[PDB]
Ligand binder design. Structure first.
Ligand code: NAG
Ligand code: CA
Ligand code: CA
Ligand code: CA
Lengths: 220, 215, 211
């Protein structure tokens, strides 16, 4: 498509251009991630990423674990979802949420030294910082569930969460997260791999996160 | 503060053309996509098209591709909708809305502008007072024989809002619209106070003020 | 083209009731759905964006839920202002298709109409036409009968009803009898007989030409 060239990176997701060849609409359909399958071997893995069956050819970390269809037990039980969200990182151990599907209960049962992944995961959430921080437990739990690893906000020099307003003239929220793989040992070695997975979920219409995201990064 | 003011609209002949304007202010125009939404009288909302003030890019509803045109003027922070080969079915209130980043939900909307596609001719209204009789008294104004719609009726330059009832216009046998605007006021105030109905029919550039007095 | 079907098309509930409106998409849209509230003759107001997020200023009673195709807008305790038409919208991808609409009406206690009759203005008579107006103020339910007279006039009157009040949930009716200067000055008594559920016997408001 020739029309797709002008539509590239126009901050509008054009389904017509939502393909690997068109660069996922120049990141418009993949949360600004140029190529989530940057290092994946076999192509058409993105075509099999949206199913539930285990496709061993796309199971590699480079091929984004085939949306964890081979690892699994796959999703946190919807019946227990609200409980796990409310009891995430509350100081008290809730064993029923202590699984990779339900974000390991905010490491309440693993109180084990931290094994942080390389870098800082940066999310531009289309919510004001005040609204976001009120729903912090739910935000973290659901992200810690989708990424199958523990996630917490990066802290200031004073010890406060790194949640800042996005674009001061108007408004948007910049959320800086850290990935903890202490209960991991598949899993994410850095922030950019997790960013590519979130970007890949967007592209194949499989991202189930109730918080509207603008983009996803990986900075050191 | 974010503001969208839409200009244009009124009466247009069937098969004719009409351009609409939406003047944006209170934000960085180049940062968000701009949308046109229409609503037929009595019917639901319908998305027309959108334009990117930063790229010049457009997206349309198939139903309007070809006969409708969307344009921008960054200097004037304005968005335009050009409508050609206008049919009776295009009679609707056209709203301009600001598109929120990546997902296009609309938090900010314009006031809306009515577009009437009819062969009939424009006519100004005739305001007549509905005088109170003789402990609550009712008075009003009869906005009779006009075309097209709409008419804006206020009481004492908008300072009187309590008990006001501006009835929806009813199309007469003559093909002209007619409505009434009533207000319930205390009987004791009839002799020492003043009641004025401010009627405005923008399509015919008519502004009539009437002092409702007990005969 | 992905379709947006709203259910029901119309609903009638009392103040304090739990109101449930659904919007179903033909294909999967995920969290790409927004809910709007539109009051008569006004621009739509954003309530819920991205399936479950409540917009700033929207009262706590409004709630959004769902993922994929089946979405729900919930009003925990209905209020008189909540009388409006509610629309769902498909997000992220063009076309940004709106739903059919769901009109929410409110059940209220029976209210009797306050009847008022207005004679044609002296300035109107000069034009050649004579309009006699009968007003029915703040009543419930909508269903009311208006008869023009002592000679029952038919085929020369037009009715107009206001949309439900934002605070007391009542309606208001206006009946306009249209005559000529000749036919008007030919008769003396002008009356409007009103029949409504809130009235024990029909209320008649009359005037005598000239007087
Ligand atoms: C998966 O994606 C392919 C193209 O990327 C599409 O044709 C197919 O309908 C999708 N499958 C499901 C189950 O959504
Ligand atoms: Ca694009
Ligand atoms: Ca698979
Ligand atoms: Ca816990």
């Amino acid at each position: 498509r020739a029309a797709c060239q002008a539509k590239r990176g126009d901050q509008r997701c054009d389904r017509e251009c939502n393909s690997p060849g068109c660069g996922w609409d120049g990141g418009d359909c993949s949360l600004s991630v140029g190529d989530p399958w940057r290092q994946c071997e076999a192509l058409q893995c993105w075509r099999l990423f949206n199913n539930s069956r285990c496709d061993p050819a796309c199971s590699s970390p480079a091929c984004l674990y085939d949306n964890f269809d081979c690892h699994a037990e796959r999703t946190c039980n919807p019946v227990y979802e609200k409980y796990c969200a409310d009891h995430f990182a509350d100081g008290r151990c809730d064993q029923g949420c202590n699984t990779e599907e339900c974000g390991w209960d905010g490491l309440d049962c693993a109180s084990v030294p931290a094994l942080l992944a390389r870098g800082v995961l940066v999310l531009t959430v289309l919510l004001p910082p005040e609204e976001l921080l009120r729903s912090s437990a739910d935000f973290l739990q659901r992200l810690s569930a989708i990424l199958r690893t523990s996630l917490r906000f990066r802290l200031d020099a004073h010890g406060q969460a790194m949640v800042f307003p996005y674009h001061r003239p108007e408004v948007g929220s910049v959320v800086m997260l850290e990935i903890d793989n202490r209960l991991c040992l598949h899993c994410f070695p850095d922030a950019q791999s997790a960013a590519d997975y979130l970007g890949a979920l967007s592209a194949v219409e499989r991202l189930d996160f109730p918080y509207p995201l603008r983009d996803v990064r990986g900075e050191p | 503060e974010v503001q969208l003011v839409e200009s244009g609209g009124g009466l247009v002949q069937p098969g004719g053309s009409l351009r609409l304007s939406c003047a944006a202010s209170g934000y960085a125009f180049t940062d968000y996509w701009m949308t046109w939404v229409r609503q037929a009288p009595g019917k639901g909302l319908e998305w027309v098209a959108e334009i990117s003030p930063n790229s010049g890019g457009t997206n349309f509803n198939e139903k309007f591709k070809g006969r409708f045109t969307i344009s921008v003027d960054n200097a004037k922070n304005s968005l335009y909708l050009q409508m050609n080969s206008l049919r009776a079915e295009d009679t609707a209130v056209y709203y301009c809305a600001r598109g929120e980043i990546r997902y296009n939900w609309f938090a900010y909307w314009g006031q809306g502008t009515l577009v009437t596609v009819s062969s009939a001719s424009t006519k100004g209204p005739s305001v007549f007072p509905l005088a109170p009789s003789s402990g609550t008294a009712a008075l009003g104004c009869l906005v009779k024989d006009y075309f097209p719609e709409p008419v804006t009726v206020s009481w004492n330059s908008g300072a009187l809002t309590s008990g006001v009832h501006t009835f929806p216009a009813v199309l007469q046998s003559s093909g002209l619209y007619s409505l009434s605007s009533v207000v319930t006021v205390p009987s004791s105030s009839l002799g020492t106070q003043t009641y004025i109905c401010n009627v405005n029919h923008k399509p015919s550039n008519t502004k009539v003020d009437k002092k409702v007095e007990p005969k | 083209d992905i379709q947006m079907t709203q259910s029901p098309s119309s609903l009638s509930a009392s103040v304090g009731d739990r109101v449930t409106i659904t919007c179903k998409a033909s294909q999967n849209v995920g969290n790409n759905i927004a809910w709007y509230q539109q009051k008569p003759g006004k621009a739509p107001k954003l309530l819920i964006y991205y399936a479950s997020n409540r917009y700033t200023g929207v009262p706590s009673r409004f709630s959004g839920s769902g993922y994929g195709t089946d979405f729900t807008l919930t009003i925990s305790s209905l209020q008189p202002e909540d009388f409006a038409t509610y629309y769902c919208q498909r997000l992220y991808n063009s076309p940004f298709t709106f739903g059919g609409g769901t009109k929410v009406e409110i059940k209220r206690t029976v209210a009797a109409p306050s009847v008022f009759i207005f004679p044609p203005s002296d300035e109107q008579l000069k034009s050649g036409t004579a309009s006699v107006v009968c007003l029915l103020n703040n009543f419930y339910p909508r269903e009311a009968k208006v008869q023009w007279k002592n000679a029952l006039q038919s085929g020369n009157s037009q009715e107009s009803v206001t949309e439900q009040d934002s605070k007391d949930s009542t309606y208001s009716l206006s009946s306009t009898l249209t005559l000529s200067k000749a036919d008007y000055e030919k008769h003396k008594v002008y009356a409007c007989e009103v029949t409504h559920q809130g009235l024990s016997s029909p209320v008649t408001k009359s005037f005598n030409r000239g007087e």
